[PDB]
Symmetry: none
Subunit: 131 residues, 3 copies
Amino acid sequence: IDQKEKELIKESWKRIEPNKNEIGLLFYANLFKEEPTVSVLFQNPISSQSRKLMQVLGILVQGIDNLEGLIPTLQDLGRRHKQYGVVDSHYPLVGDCLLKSIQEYLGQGFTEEAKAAWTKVYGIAAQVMTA
Amino acid sequence: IDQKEKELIKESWKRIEPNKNEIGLLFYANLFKEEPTVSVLFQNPISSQSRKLMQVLGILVQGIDNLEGLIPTLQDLGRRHKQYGVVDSHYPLVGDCLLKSIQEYLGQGFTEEAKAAWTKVYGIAAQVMTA
Amino acid sequence: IDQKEKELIKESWKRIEPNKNEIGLLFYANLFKEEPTVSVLFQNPISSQSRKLMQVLGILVQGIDNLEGLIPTLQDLGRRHKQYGVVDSHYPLVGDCLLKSIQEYLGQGFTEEAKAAWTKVYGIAAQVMTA
Ligand code: HEM
Ligand code: HEM
Ligand code: HEM
């Protein structure tokens, strides 16, 4: 993750943040339309789950200058996800759906370079979580 | 089985399947320690026998939306089992041992919800096989 | 152990190792079928037991150029074995079953010359453990 990529994360976060509730909820709609059996793993109200996911994305942004410091957090997270029945193959699905939902809700406000930076950051977080 | 159970079977199979050889082999070790008398019935290499049992569990997953479609297959397999010396009381022994072995090998990666759904699917298969 | 036998141990271990989880669990199933009386000695989860056995076999391979260096390790392990109820006459049975299980899982992958070598290496380890 280079300096330009860090600043693209911060800039695009300023576009995602004020629309975070909508982007999270669109993400679950899009995810359950693309993989029609994964919704059973979600046992809590989806509005609550969406707040949790968007809070962690905001933590990644907040730590973007030193993702290394987020390694323990992400490891603990990744462990809990195995306990929910989440498997390694779910991560590319979730990443693609999240990035497409951000791109969908913001349109041109989410730039191609910003989406490339988020692809990398998600790929990092997924690697750390899946050990 | 209901829609949530069908989904749990499909999603949990994504963790059981890549570990299916180990889970099968663990299941024969566990079954032979729990009920040493049953081991005489197994006359073929256990490495090949585990492959066959795991192949049928994959078929149950592939067919899980319409287990009725599998009734004739399961009836033929139940008839063959009677030829091997298998009797009705062996089915609950085998289901307990198989479920325990998937729970052992996967630990908390086999969720309580998935275990309940697989418990039900095993019961259905054992019922069809024994008429 | 001569130079050629040492090489055969090292050669066959590159085939055994990637398969070690399955070979160790197949060994328990086969042991418990061949010798139903001994399963009562194995009181911990067999998935964890198999990991422990295959780890020590790795250590025997790692130290194959100087098995005399492993004498203390093997003495300590043999003492533990007495505390688990294991007696000398168990050793040939376990060795036979272990070798037959590696042969079964690898087939053609396990040559006669490699099986002979492992026979000698098992015999050395069992002699040391039984002092
Ligand atoms: C970087 C990727 C991800 C992040 C930041 C993330 C974030 C979160 C967070 C913050 C939680 C709340 C509970 C906890 O902290 O343990 C959660 C729960 C959960 N996540 Fe994720 N997640 C990610 C990937 C995934 C993937 C790939 C899936 C696959 C479907 C998934 C499915 C779930 C499920 C099923 C729950 C539990 C919902 C419940 O309470 O029933 N997550 N996730
Ligand atoms: C849902 C439950 C079961 C499934 C899916 C299943 C599956 C299989 C399959 C696929 C075979 C290969 C031969 C064939 O297709 O006829 C087989 C053979 C066998 N099964 Fe099962 N089985 C089940 C329950 C049982 C039970 C309850 C026992 C009681 C010990 C058992 C004992 C055996 C034996 C002895 C053989 C033959 C081994 C040999 O060839 O010598 N199975 N089983
Ligand atoms: C070269 C031969 C063997 C090796 C490398 C080996 C390795 C081990 C290892 C690493 C352990 C873990 C506990 C510890 O480290 O003290 C162990 C435990 C054990 N071994 Fe062996 N072993 C061998 C032979 C045997 C034989 C001949 C038996 C006879 C049945 C046997 C039965 C057991 C039992 C019952 C335990 C304890 C299981 C428990 O925790 O309940 N092992 N063996």
